[PDB]
C-alpha cells in the first residue's frame, strides 16, 4: 500500500450518505474508531488511472476548510475514495431547511468558511471547477467545507450553466476567474437559502440571459455590502473580477461592520 492507499479491510460500513455522480456514498469507522465516508465508484464512471494519479496531488492539499481526501482504495473493484466525514451532509439540503432559522451573521461566516478553502486552493494553483453549494458540505459544529474539489475531470444536461461565467459559455475557457464567478453563484444560494438561481430559467434561457450582460439580483438577506461582494464577482471582463484573497478580505471586512 502506497501513501494514497488505505486498506479497505480496515473499514467498517455503517450507513448509507447518499449517491453522486460516480454512485453511493457511505458512512464508516475506519480500524473502528475514526469517522469516514467512503465513495464507492460504480464502474464505468470515473477515468480511474487519471483520478489516482491526482489523488496523489490532492492527498497534500490540507485545509481546515477543505474537505479532507484521507485516501483510496485501488486494488478491488470498485475503487473507494475515502474523505472526511461531515455529520449535517450537503450544504444546499442545509439551506433549504427553515427550522434553523438561520441569521445572516451565520449566512456570512458559511460564505467565509468556503472563502478560506477557495483562498488555499488558489494558493495552490488548484481550480475546484464545479464550486456550488451542491459540493459543500457541513460538519457537526455548523463549518462549511469544500468538498469534490477538481473531480468533475475524471467523470466520463447535467453541465453547470448556472454557476458558469460567459467566457466559459461561449468559449470554454476555464481559469481561477471562472472559480470566482462560481463563487459568487454561491454566495447568492447561501443568501437564497438554497433556491435555484435564475430559478425562472431553463440553462439554455440562463446562458442567454448571462451572454446579454444580466445577472442575478441581490436575495432579500444580503446586506448592501454583502451584494457589493458577490456581484463583484460576476464582471463581464474576467480580468476585472477579485481573487479569492480579496474577496476574503473584503466578507472579513463586512463582518467587523455587520
Ligand atoms: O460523490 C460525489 N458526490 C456525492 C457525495 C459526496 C459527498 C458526500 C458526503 N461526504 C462526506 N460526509 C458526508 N455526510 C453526508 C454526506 C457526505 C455524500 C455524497 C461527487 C463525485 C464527483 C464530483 C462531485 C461529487
Redesign the pocket.
Known sequence: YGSWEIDPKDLTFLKE???????V?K?GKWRGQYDV?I?MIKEGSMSEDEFIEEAKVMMNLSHEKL?QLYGVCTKQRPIF?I????????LLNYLREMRHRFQTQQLLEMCKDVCEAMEYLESKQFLHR?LAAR?C?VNDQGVVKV??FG??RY?LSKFPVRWSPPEVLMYSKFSSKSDIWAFGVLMWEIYSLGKMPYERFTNSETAEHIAQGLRLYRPHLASEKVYTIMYSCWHEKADERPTFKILLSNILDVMDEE
Request: with cysteine; charged share 15%; glycine share 14%.
Open positions: 450518505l447518499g449517491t453522486g455522480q460516480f454512485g456514498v458512512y465516508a465513495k474537505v475514495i474523505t472526511e466525514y461531515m455529520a449535517n451532509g450537503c464545479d459540493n458540505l468538498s469534490d473531480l468533475s467523470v
